[PDB]
């Protein structure tokens, strides 16, 4: 099985540089070009360049010639991309991949999970987690909705869970949004009205960057 594992989420400051890696397995790392594609959170895909580990030869699209530098270590079957003079425009997920369609019996097209790069000057900050209980008297429906507000954290992600994961159905955790230079997010959960509050509903928020883990029970009233 062809595998391309990329290094995890990285935080970088304006003007700094970052380096990411991509380990290959399941095929001759030295036989196919290893490509790097950029994807802005909103737009499409953009080819940055590629490196042939066979002899470490590289090729870049004009635009990135000075932005990135491609590297490889055949020894560990690993590729590296380094992006310098970071700007907000460099924030995006970067993918490494193998793509070749001219070898008869075996077509190569595999991508890594992608590496998120966030350029920013915000300081790492644990989130504030607030329980959202129903407004007074709101208990006549067949179902009832509860919420969890995660506000003021950086960088992301944040791992929001209901009842340590036991509760996954009827939930919606919305995409994080920027408030000032910190992120805020929310999740709603809908359960059978007869369920809550007799049976506890707890919002669990984990923020790896700040090594924090918080559980916030949704108390009525």
């Amino acid at each position: 099985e062809v595998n391309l594992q990329q290094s995890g989420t990285v935080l970088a400051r304006p003007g700094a540089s970052v380096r990411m890696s991509c380990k290959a397995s399941g095929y001759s790392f030295t036989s196919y070009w290893l490509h790097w594609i950029k994807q802005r959170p909103g737009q499409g895909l953009e080819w940055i360049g590629g490196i042939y580990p066979g002899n470490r030869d590289t090729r870049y699209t004009q635009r990135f010639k000075d932005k990135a530098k491609l590297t490889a270590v055949t020894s560990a079957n690993t590729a590296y991309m380094e992006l310098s003079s970071l700007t907000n425009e460099d924030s995006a997920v970067y993918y490494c991949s193998i793509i070749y369609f001219d070898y008869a019996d075996f077509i190569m097209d595999y991508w890594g999970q992608g590496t998120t790069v966030t350029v920013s000057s915000a300081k790492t900050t644990a989130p504030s987690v607030y329980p959202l209980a129903p407004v007074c008297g709101d208990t006549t429906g067949s179902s009832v909705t509860l919420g969890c507000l995660v506000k003021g954290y950086f960088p992301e992600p944040v791992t929001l869970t209901w009842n340590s994961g036991s509760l996954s159905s009827g939930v919606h955790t919305f995409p994080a949004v920027l408030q000032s230079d910190l992120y805020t997010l929310s999740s709603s959960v809908t359960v059978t009205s007869s369920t809550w509050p007799s049976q506890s509903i707890t919002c669990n928020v984990a923020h790896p960057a700040s090594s924090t883990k918080v559980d916030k029970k949704i108390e009525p009233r």
Partner: protein, 219 residues
Amino acid sequence: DIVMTQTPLSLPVSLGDKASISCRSSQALVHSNGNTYLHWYLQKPGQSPKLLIYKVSNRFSGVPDRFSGSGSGTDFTLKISRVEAEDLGVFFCSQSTHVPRTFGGGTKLEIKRADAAPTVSIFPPSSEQLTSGGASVVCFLNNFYPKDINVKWKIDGSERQNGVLNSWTDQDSKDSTYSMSSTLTLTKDEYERHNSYTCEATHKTSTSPIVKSFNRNEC
């Protein structure tokens, strides 16, 4: 660089029906070696782009037969004859007969379902947040289709135009509806200076908006 133009931008398709995505290139894609390197990728939410079709009409291993491609020179077409929920995501046509290889803008494939009006829920600021000196009123609009919808905030009967952040979830695979959050963030002093807090959702499913409200003087 060679530019790829995909159309439409969004593509609503009932389950079980067929979908066609078009892709044109700014220049001929027939390589001197005689091949035409035009491929089709599908990127599911949160995942990496996954190859569906390479060289105008060949299916990648594991790709079911309901997916097929055609076209020539500069005009190409991806077809999906029996759309399923799993096809949810964005399709990208790609070209690599010229360097650098380039991708189309993408086509978001949406699953059509009967129109459904959102369920609205409103939530006053929590005591913990108030204590911090802030106050966020939250409003959830869940399970509605189509995605188009307008939310208006009213404080003591007056429309609030700023301090509002909105976030939408992508289409629910097993449901085909959308959900969203509307958050009004005020200062505690500001929050306590008013009584009525209203969340108003206007969706095609009705002429009269859905209204959720609460009076601070009463909770």
